[PDB]
Amino acid sequence: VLPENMKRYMGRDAQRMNILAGRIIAETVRSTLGPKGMDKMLVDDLGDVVVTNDGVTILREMSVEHPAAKMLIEVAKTQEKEVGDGTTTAVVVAGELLRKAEELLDQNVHPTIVVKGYQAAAQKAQELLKTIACEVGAQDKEILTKIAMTSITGKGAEKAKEKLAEIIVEAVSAVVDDEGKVDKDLIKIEKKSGASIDDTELIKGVLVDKERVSAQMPKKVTDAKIALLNCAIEETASEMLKDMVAEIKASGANVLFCQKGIDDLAQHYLAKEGIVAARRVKKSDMEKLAKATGANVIAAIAALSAQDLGDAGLVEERKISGDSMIFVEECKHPKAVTMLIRGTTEHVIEEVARAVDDAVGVVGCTIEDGRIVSGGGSTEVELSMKLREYAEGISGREQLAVRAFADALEVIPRTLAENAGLDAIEILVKVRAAHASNGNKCAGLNVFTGAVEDMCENGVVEPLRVKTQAIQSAAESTEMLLRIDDVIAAE
Amino acid sequence: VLPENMKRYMGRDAQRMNILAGRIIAETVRSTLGPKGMDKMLVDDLGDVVVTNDGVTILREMSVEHPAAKMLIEVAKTQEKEVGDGTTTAVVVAGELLRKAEELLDQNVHPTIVVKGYQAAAQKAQELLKTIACEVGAQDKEILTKIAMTSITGKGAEKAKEKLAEIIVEAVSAVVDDEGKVDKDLIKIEKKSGASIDDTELIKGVLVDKERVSAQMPKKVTDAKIALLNCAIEETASEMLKDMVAEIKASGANVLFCQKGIDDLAQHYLAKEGIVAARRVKKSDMEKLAKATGANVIAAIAALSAQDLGDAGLVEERKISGDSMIFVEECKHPKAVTMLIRGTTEHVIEEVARAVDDAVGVVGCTIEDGRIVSGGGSTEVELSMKLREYAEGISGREQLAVRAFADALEVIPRTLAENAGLDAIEILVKVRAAHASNGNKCAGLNVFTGAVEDMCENGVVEPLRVKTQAIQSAAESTEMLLRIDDVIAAE
């Protein structure tokens, strides 16, 4: 019935193969887990080199075959869209979840027991997270910089994590408006090789990666009237093109951003009128300019009026590491800011660009969700303690699946210690004992000194969403995977 | 006479090969049978992954060679079009039908005896179904939610089966109008990743997966006059395109849905007139909008008049999990509703989308057919009991074919127990004895506790049509298959 070459796995082989595929992914990423994680190098079919420690980037760039590895990739992408971080963590948890679950399937325990047990344990784990959750101010400067800096650490950018947190916290508060929703488009991430990471700074306005289209145009314009046109400024014959220039001038425009091209004939007439112009402007840049300046993007040149013009206090052409760029600054009430990232090499400022991708993310998460929890494996250990007691209350065979889930949470503090170069046996014993005796905000592992410490005292906390999202995504992913008992794949 | 490479089967080999092909299909799907059935994974030639437990989906996506497997696929498709559910059930019954029948063919019993016996037994089985059929109210809230929720169980979506049944029962009653015929087009199934299944909700109006074509257009319009045009709004020169805009404005239109494109020149003039617009609108969406709002879809822009405009109380652009969509709500007397499905992942809300595909189906079936029967294998067991007595009355060789048909019905309660992880021997003995002693509405197997129970007390019932359609389709399919004694297939 089926074509020769089609392959099929079933029962124990389907489940082992599928868990194996997910395990291979977990094996790849688990060595990036934590501040003391290492970097991977991915080289494509063309020779292009991608160096990273991000689970999503790694999973997006690598080309897997097995559906299970493809599902973990898609889960990692959702994790990025929602939280940003917790990617590698969730994969490692999901891997251990399947490892634990396989022992039950191998023991001939009906799949419905494992699934139901995980549904119960995951529901109780999130309830426990809400119980330990600490309420903090959505706009508290202190916790904003603590979340920010904590996220930054373990990265190359940690050198200037204080300057970066200061930029990111102020940038979000500026653009977030109400309490609140922050748009990542309102905090522009610009990077240019040169100087150090310490020279990275925040620009109260918009930096456009364009130059003054003519040498004869002014290089500095004050009290600027910004025009946004997407129609190319090219008309046959000089008189006809000059008419267009006169129409732009008539509106009172002093600074002109054209999405398409500007013919040399128009550039000369624009220069005569003292109107500065930049062509080939990116659609994104036209939008950021419209938002900040209050300029209205106009289709037809004829349609541009004075009421469509935006305001900027100063528009000036400056060279950054030699390259000419236009600074739109000193606006009355800008709605967008720009973060100019500096550093010794392109690869460094790319790492910083990712670092601040996460930093601005988690600060936004802290504003929207005023619940945080202790880090350093404190949650997962607290969950092990409480879910073990829950398991005892539950009883039957279901308590074994819940016991496996609760114990599976230990993979995180265990792998964190491995990457830190710590003796996991000594860590797990001393941390667990210290956790049970002193508490959840009086423990955890500090990988930076390589010993059990007080995570709360040191400001080592993570947004509640990280931990609760990890449960939702991971539990649903491994639950689905467990449900498949027969894989039929065409060649 | 015939090309070398052409293949031919005849007599016992044609019949065995054909039954084998049908058996392989039955073997594939029978493990999805029941609430405790498992999921399959189908991977195509491109790598695309389809995860399901639906017999039709599985049969549509898989590529069979043998005509018999192709016939079972087409039967499964008819089962979907008519009933929705009962797919896997009918295939399993048909498989056992051919297994039983083959024993008679192998015993050298003339094919006409087997066929006639099945024609008789199937006619009596449906008569027995009408005898046990329980009359219920076509619009009885209680049985509507009992049919709904029962259908939902055994799926990932069962977590919120109470919220889902509430949505589906109310949705159908709203759009069904008279008693009655419900159109599935009037209950829109919309899905967007984010939140949980508990956040799934019913929208008294139409949700369109489009955004406001210009940033300069209002984001909220009240007392909306909806226009439906399928002509692209693009005219050479600004004056000529503005004329079109003025004509739309003249009609009194405030909200405009264009099936094709809208030129930027028109977007700006529309924004000046305070008319909001969405382009590239799907033909389906243009139709749902026409039905609900009472808007008349117009071909030529010139032809649009005030009498063609539909009404909506509120038309507003909202972001759902970030994506901008248009809500058309608060209409006086809407004829269409929208069900917005939420959930943690795309794969989950896809499973929910299928779950509610069936839920809305069986509720519609319950309104059109006010006859239901007890589930949990009660019918098939009742049929075994009565058709055995009928067989004794019939006598001759025909009674053996009828005995085989009656006994073949047991495959369902037997396989249900297998998938539940129950000892089929203990089940079949205790259930059959309990059925004969206590009755048909005082028995059946409860796979959820893994023991014989009272299906009727627990509200475990299925529409009469499920069981009577299963007989018609299955009996006609296996009857046809039995009729072929010679298969000549070209290469």
Short mmCIF file of all heavy atoms in Angstrom, two decimals, chain A residues 1 67 71 74 110 296-300 472 476 480 482-491, chain B residues 24 38-45 49 51 62-65 216 264-265 268 344 347-348 419:
data_model
loop_
_atom_site.label_atom_id
_atom_site.label_comp_id
_atom_site.label_asym_id
_atom_site.label_seq_id
_atom_site.Cartn_x
_atom_site.Cartn_y
_atom_site.Cartn_z
N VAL A 1 0.82 -1.23 0.00
CA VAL A 1 0.00 0.00 0.00
C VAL A 1 0.86 1.28 0.00
O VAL A 1 0.56 2.27 -0.66
CB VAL A 1 -0.94 0.04 1.22
CG1 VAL A 1 -1.70 1.36 1.26
CG2 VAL A 1 -1.92 -1.13 1.17
N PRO A 67 10.81 15.63 13.31
CA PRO A 67 9.70 16.54 13.66
C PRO A 67 9.82 17.05 15.10
O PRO A 67 9.60 18.23 15.37
CB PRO A 67 8.44 15.69 13.52
CG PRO A 67 8.79 14.72 12.40
CD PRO A 67 10.25 14.37 12.67
N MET A 71 9.74 20.72 16.48
CA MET A 71 8.77 21.25 17.46
C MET A 71 9.44 22.05 18.59
O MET A 71 9.01 23.14 18.95
CB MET A 71 7.96 20.10 18.06
CG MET A 71 6.98 19.45 17.09
SD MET A 71 6.07 18.08 17.84
CE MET A 71 5.12 17.50 16.43
N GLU A 74 10.22 25.49 17.27
CA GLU A 74 9.03 26.36 17.21
C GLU A 74 8.63 26.86 18.60
O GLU A 74 8.33 28.04 18.78
CB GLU A 74 7.86 25.63 16.56
CG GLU A 74 8.02 25.36 15.07
CD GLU A 74 6.99 24.39 14.57
OE1 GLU A 74 6.25 23.87 15.37
OE2 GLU A 74 6.86 24.26 13.38
N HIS A 110 0.90 3.20 31.75
CA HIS A 110 0.06 3.74 30.67
C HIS A 110 0.36 5.24 30.46
O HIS A 110 0.47 5.98 31.44
CB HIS A 110 -1.41 3.51 31.00
CG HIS A 110 -2.32 3.80 29.80
ND1 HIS A 110 -2.55 4.98 29.25
CD2 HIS A 110 -2.92 2.89 29.04
CE1 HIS A 110 -3.28 4.80 28.15
NE2 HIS A 110 -3.52 3.52 28.03
N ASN A 296 3.85 63.51 8.55
CA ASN A 296 2.87 62.63 7.89
C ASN A 296 3.42 62.17 6.54
O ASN A 296 3.75 62.98 5.67
CB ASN A 296 1.53 63.32 7.71
CG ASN A 296 0.46 62.42 7.14
OD1 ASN A 296 0.53 61.19 7.26
ND2 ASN A 296 -0.48 63.02 6.46
N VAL A 297 3.58 60.86 6.44
CA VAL A 297 4.12 60.23 5.23
C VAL A 297 3.13 60.42 4.08
O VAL A 297 1.98 59.96 4.12
CB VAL A 297 4.40 58.73 5.43
CG1 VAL A 297 4.87 58.09 4.13
CG2 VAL A 297 5.44 58.52 6.52
N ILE A 298 3.61 61.04 3.05
CA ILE A 298 2.73 61.40 1.92
C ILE A 298 3.16 60.59 0.69
O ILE A 298 4.36 60.40 0.42
CB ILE A 298 2.78 62.91 1.60
CG1 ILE A 298 2.29 63.72 2.80
CG2 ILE A 298 1.94 63.21 0.36
CD1 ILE A 298 0.86 63.42 3.20
N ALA A 299 2.15 60.11 -0.01
CA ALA A 299 2.36 59.33 -1.23
C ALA A 299 2.76 60.22 -2.41
O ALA A 299 3.89 60.20 -2.84
CB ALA A 299 1.10 58.54 -1.58
N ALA A 300 1.85 61.15 -2.75
CA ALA A 300 2.04 62.02 -3.91
C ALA A 300 2.69 63.31 -3.42
O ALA A 300 2.24 63.93 -2.46
CB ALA A 300 0.67 62.31 -4.54
N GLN A 472 4.31 26.20 31.09
CA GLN A 472 3.26 26.11 30.05
C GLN A 472 3.81 25.51 28.75
O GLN A 472 3.42 24.39 28.38
CB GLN A 472 2.67 27.49 29.75
CG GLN A 472 1.56 27.91 30.70
CD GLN A 472 0.39 26.95 30.67
OE1 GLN A 472 0.06 26.31 31.67
NE2 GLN A 472 -0.25 26.84 29.51
N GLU A 476 3.29 21.48 27.70
CA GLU A 476 2.48 21.27 26.48
C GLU A 476 3.26 20.61 25.34
O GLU A 476 2.74 19.74 24.64
CB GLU A 476 1.90 22.60 26.00
CG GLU A 476 0.80 23.17 26.89
CD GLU A 476 -0.35 22.21 27.01
OE1 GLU A 476 -0.85 21.77 26.00
OE2 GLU A 476 -0.66 21.82 28.11
N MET A 480 2.40 16.74 24.12
CA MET A 480 2.12 16.46 22.71
C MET A 480 3.01 15.32 22.19
O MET A 480 2.52 14.37 21.57
CB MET A 480 2.32 17.71 21.86
CG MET A 480 1.97 17.54 20.39
SD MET A 480 2.09 19.09 19.47
CE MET A 480 1.63 18.54 17.83
N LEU A 482 4.59 12.98 23.76
CA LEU A 482 4.19 11.72 24.40
C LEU A 482 2.95 11.06 23.78
O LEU A 482 2.82 9.84 23.81
CB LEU A 482 3.94 11.97 25.89
CG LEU A 482 5.19 12.26 26.73
CD1 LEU A 482 4.80 12.69 28.13
CD2 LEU A 482 6.07 11.01 26.77
N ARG A 483 2.10 11.90 23.20
CA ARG A 483 0.82 11.45 22.62
C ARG A 483 0.98 10.67 21.31
O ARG A 483 0.07 9.92 20.93
CB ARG A 483 -0.14 12.62 22.44
CG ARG A 483 -0.70 13.19 23.73
CD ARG A 483 -1.55 14.39 23.55
NE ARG A 483 -2.06 14.96 24.79
CZ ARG A 483 -3.15 14.52 25.44
NH1 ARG A 483 -3.88 13.53 24.96
NH2 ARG A 483 -3.50 15.12 26.56
N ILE A 484 2.07 10.89 20.59
CA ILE A 484 2.35 10.21 19.31
C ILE A 484 2.94 8.81 19.57
O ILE A 484 3.99 8.67 20.20
CB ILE A 484 3.31 11.02 18.42
CG1 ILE A 484 2.60 12.24 17.83
CG2 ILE A 484 3.87 10.14 17.31
CD1 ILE A 484 2.39 13.36 18.83
N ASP A 485 2.30 7.81 18.98
CA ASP A 485 2.73 6.40 19.17
C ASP A 485 3.10 5.73 17.84
O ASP A 485 3.36 4.52 17.80
CB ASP A 485 1.62 5.60 19.86
CG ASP A 485 0.34 5.46 19.05
OD1 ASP A 485 0.29 6.00 17.97
OD2 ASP A 485 -0.50 4.69 19.44
N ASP A 486 3.00 6.48 16.75
CA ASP A 486 3.16 5.95 15.40
C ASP A 486 3.55 7.08 14.45
O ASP A 486 2.80 8.05 14.29
CB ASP A 486 1.88 5.27 14.92
CG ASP A 486 2.00 4.57 13.57
OD1 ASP A 486 3.10 4.48 13.07
OD2 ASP A 486 1.03 4.00 13.12
N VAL A 487 4.74 6.96 13.90
CA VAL A 487 5.32 7.97 13.00
C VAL A 487 5.50 7.34 11.61
O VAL A 487 6.26 6.39 11.47
CB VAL A 487 6.68 8.50 13.51
CG1 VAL A 487 7.25 9.52 12.53
CG2 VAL A 487 6.53 9.10 14.89
N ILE A 488 4.80 7.91 10.65
CA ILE A 488 4.91 7.49 9.23
C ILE A 488 5.45 8.66 8.40
O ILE A 488 4.75 9.66 8.19
CB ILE A 488 3.55 7.04 8.66
CG1 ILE A 488 3.00 5.86 9.46
CG2 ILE A 488 3.69 6.68 7.19
CD1 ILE A 488 1.59 5.47 9.08
N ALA A 489 6.68 8.51 7.94
CA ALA A 489 7.38 9.59 7.22
C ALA A 489 7.73 9.14 5.80
O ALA A 489 8.39 8.11 5.61
CB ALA A 489 8.63 10.01 7.97
N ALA A 490 7.24 9.90 4.83
CA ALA A 490 7.51 9.67 3.40
C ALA A 490 8.94 10.12 3.06
O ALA A 490 9.48 11.04 3.68
CB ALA A 490 6.50 10.39 2.52
N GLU A 491 9.55 9.47 2.09
CA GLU A 491 10.93 9.85 1.70
C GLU A 491 10.96 11.18 0.95
O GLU A 491 10.15 11.28 -0.01
CB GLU A 491 11.57 8.76 0.84
CG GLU A 491 13.04 8.99 0.53
CD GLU A 491 13.90 8.77 1.75
OE1 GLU A 491 13.39 8.27 2.72
OE2 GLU A 491 15.08 8.99 1.66
N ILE B 24 -5.29 -3.17 6.68
CA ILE B 24 -4.14 -2.29 6.97
C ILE B 24 -4.63 -0.89 7.36
O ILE B 24 -4.16 -0.35 8.35
CB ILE B 24 -3.19 -2.17 5.76
CG1 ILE B 24 -2.50 -3.51 5.49
CG2 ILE B 24 -2.16 -1.08 6.00
CD1 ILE B 24 -1.80 -3.57 4.15
N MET B 38 -4.66 7.10 20.92
CA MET B 38 -3.39 7.84 20.77
C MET B 38 -3.35 8.62 19.46
O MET B 38 -4.25 8.53 18.62
CB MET B 38 -2.20 6.88 20.84
CG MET B 38 -2.09 6.12 22.16
SD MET B 38 -1.64 7.19 23.54
CE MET B 38 0.11 7.44 23.22
N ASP B 39 -2.31 9.43 19.31
CA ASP B 39 -2.12 10.27 18.11
C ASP B 39 -1.07 9.68 17.16
O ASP B 39 -0.12 9.03 17.59
CB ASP B 39 -1.71 11.69 18.51
CG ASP B 39 -2.81 12.48 19.21
OD1 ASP B 39 -3.93 12.03 19.21
OD2 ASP B 39 -2.49 13.44 19.86
N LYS B 40 -1.28 9.95 15.88
CA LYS B 40 -0.34 9.58 14.81
C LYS B 40 0.38 10.81 14.25
O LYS B 40 -0.16 11.93 14.31
CB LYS B 40 -1.06 8.84 13.69
CG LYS B 40 -1.38 7.39 13.99
CD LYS B 40 -2.40 7.27 15.12
CE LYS B 40 -2.67 5.81 15.46
NZ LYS B 40 -1.42 5.08 15.81
N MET B 41 1.54 10.56 13.69
CA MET B 41 2.37 11.59 13.03
C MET B 41 2.59 11.20 11.57
O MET B 41 3.15 10.14 11.27
CB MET B 41 3.70 11.77 13.76
CG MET B 41 4.60 12.85 13.17
SD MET B 41 6.14 13.05 14.08
CE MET B 41 5.57 13.93 15.53
N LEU B 42 2.14 12.07 10.69
CA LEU B 42 2.30 11.92 9.23
C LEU B 42 3.21 13.01 8.68
O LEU B 42 2.92 14.20 8.81
CB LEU B 42 0.93 11.96 8.53
CG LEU B 42 -0.07 10.90 9.00
CD1 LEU B 42 -1.41 11.10 8.29
CD2 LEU B 42 0.48 9.52 8.71
N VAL B 43 4.32 12.57 8.10
CA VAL B 43 5.32 13.49 7.52
C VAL B 43 5.36 13.26 6.01
O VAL B 43 5.54 12.12 5.55
CB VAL B 43 6.73 13.28 8.12
CG1 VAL B 43 7.73 14.23 7.48
CG2 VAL B 43 6.70 13.47 9.63
N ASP B 44 5.09 14.31 5.26
CA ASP B 44 5.04 14.22 3.79
C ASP B 44 6.45 14.30 3.16
O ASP B 44 7.43 14.58 3.84
CB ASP B 44 4.15 15.32 3.21
CG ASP B 44 4.73 16.73 3.36
OD1 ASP B 44 5.89 16.85 3.66
OD2 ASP B 44 4.04 17.66 3.02
N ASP B 45 6.46 14.32 1.82
CA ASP B 45 7.69 14.35 1.00
C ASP B 45 8.53 15.63 1.16
O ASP B 45 9.69 15.68 0.75
CB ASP B 45 7.33 14.15 -0.47
CG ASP B 45 6.60 12.85 -0.77
OD1 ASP B 45 5.52 12.67 -0.27
OD2 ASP B 45 7.06 12.12 -1.63
N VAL B 49 4.74 18.27 8.82
CA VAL B 49 4.33 17.38 9.93
C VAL B 49 2.86 17.60 10.29
O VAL B 49 2.43 18.71 10.65
CB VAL B 49 5.20 17.58 11.19
CG1 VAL B 49 4.76 16.63 12.29
CG2 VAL B 49 6.67 17.38 10.86
N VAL B 51 0.02 16.06 12.78
CA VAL B 51 -0.22 15.28 14.01
C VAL B 51 -1.74 15.27 14.23
O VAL B 51 -2.37 16.33 14.33
CB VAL B 51 0.49 15.86 15.24
CG1 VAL B 51 0.15 15.06 16.48
CG2 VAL B 51 2.00 15.89 15.02
N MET B 62 -2.36 10.46 3.86
CA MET B 62 -1.59 9.27 3.46
C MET B 62 -1.91 8.88 2.00
O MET B 62 -3.05 9.01 1.54
CB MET B 62 -1.89 8.11 4.40
CG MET B 62 -1.35 8.28 5.81
SD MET B 62 -1.72 6.87 6.88
CE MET B 62 -0.56 5.66 6.25
N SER B 63 -0.90 8.36 1.33
CA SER B 63 -1.02 8.00 -0.10
C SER B 63 -1.01 6.48 -0.27
O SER B 63 0.02 5.80 -0.16
CB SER B 63 0.11 8.62 -0.89
OG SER B 63 0.06 8.26 -2.25
N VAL B 64 -2.21 5.95 -0.42
CA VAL B 64 -2.42 4.51 -0.63
C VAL B 64 -2.38 4.16 -2.13
O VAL B 64 -2.75 4.97 -2.97
CB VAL B 64 -3.76 4.05 -0.03
CG1 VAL B 64 -3.81 4.34 1.46
CG2 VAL B 64 -4.93 4.72 -0.75
N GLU B 65 -2.16 2.87 -2.39
CA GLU B 65 -2.11 2.35 -3.77
C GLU B 65 -3.34 1.49 -4.13
O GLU B 65 -3.95 1.66 -5.18
CB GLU B 65 -0.84 1.53 -3.98
CG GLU B 65 0.45 2.34 -3.95
CD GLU B 65 1.65 1.47 -4.14
OE1 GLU B 65 1.79 0.50 -3.43
OE2 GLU B 65 2.38 1.70 -5.08
N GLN B 216 -3.08 57.25 9.22
CA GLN B 216 -3.80 58.54 9.36
C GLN B 216 -5.33 58.37 9.50
O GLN B 216 -6.06 59.33 9.74
CB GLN B 216 -3.50 59.44 8.16
CG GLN B 216 -4.17 60.80 8.22
CD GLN B 216 -3.70 61.73 7.12
OE1 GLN B 216 -2.82 61.38 6.32
NE2 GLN B 216 -4.28 62.92 7.06
N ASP B 264 -2.22 54.19 -2.60
CA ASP B 264 -1.88 55.15 -1.53
C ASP B 264 -2.56 56.51 -1.68
O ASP B 264 -3.03 57.08 -0.71
CB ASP B 264 -0.36 55.35 -1.47
CG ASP B 264 0.42 54.12 -1.04
OD1 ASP B 264 0.04 53.50 -0.08
OD2 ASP B 264 1.30 53.72 -1.77
N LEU B 265 -2.77 56.90 -2.94
CA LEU B 265 -3.42 58.19 -3.23
C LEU B 265 -4.87 58.24 -2.71
O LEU B 265 -5.28 59.21 -2.08
CB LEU B 265 -3.40 58.46 -4.74
CG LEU B 265 -2.18 59.24 -5.24
CD1 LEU B 265 -0.91 58.71 -4.59
CD2 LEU B 265 -2.09 59.13 -6.76
N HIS B 268 -5.03 58.28 1.36
CA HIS B 268 -4.83 59.62 1.92
C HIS B 268 -6.12 60.45 1.85
O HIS B 268 -6.47 61.14 2.80
CB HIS B 268 -3.70 60.35 1.20
CG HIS B 268 -2.33 59.88 1.59
ND1 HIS B 268 -1.76 58.74 1.07
CD2 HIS B 268 -1.43 60.39 2.45
CE1 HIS B 268 -0.56 58.57 1.59
NE2 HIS B 268 -0.33 59.56 2.44
N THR B 344 -1.95 28.16 24.26
CA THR B 344 -0.51 28.38 24.50
C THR B 344 0.38 28.23 23.25
O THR B 344 1.41 28.89 23.14
CB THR B 344 0.02 27.41 25.57
OG1 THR B 344 -0.65 27.65 26.81
CG2 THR B 344 1.52 27.58 25.76
N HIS B 347 -0.13 24.66 17.53
CA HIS B 347 -0.53 23.24 17.47
C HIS B 347 -1.68 22.87 18.41
O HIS B 347 -2.48 21.99 18.10
CB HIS B 347 0.67 22.34 17.78
CG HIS B 347 1.76 22.43 16.76
ND1 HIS B 347 1.59 22.03 15.45
CD2 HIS B 347 3.04 22.87 16.86
CE1 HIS B 347 2.72 22.23 14.78
NE2 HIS B 347 3.61 22.73 15.62
N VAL B 348 -1.78 23.61 19.51
CA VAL B 348 -2.85 23.40 20.50
C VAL B 348 -4.17 23.98 19.97
O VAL B 348 -5.16 23.24 19.89
CB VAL B 348 -2.52 24.06 21.85
CG1 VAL B 348 -3.71 23.98 22.79
CG2 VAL B 348 -1.30 23.40 22.48
N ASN B 419 -7.45 0.01 23.91
CA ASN B 419 -6.83 1.36 23.94
C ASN B 419 -6.85 1.99 25.34
O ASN B 419 -5.97 2.76 25.70
CB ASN B 419 -7.49 2.29 22.95
CG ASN B 419 -7.16 1.99 21.52
OD1 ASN B 419 -6.16 1.33 21.22
ND2 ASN B 419 -7.95 2.53 20.63
#
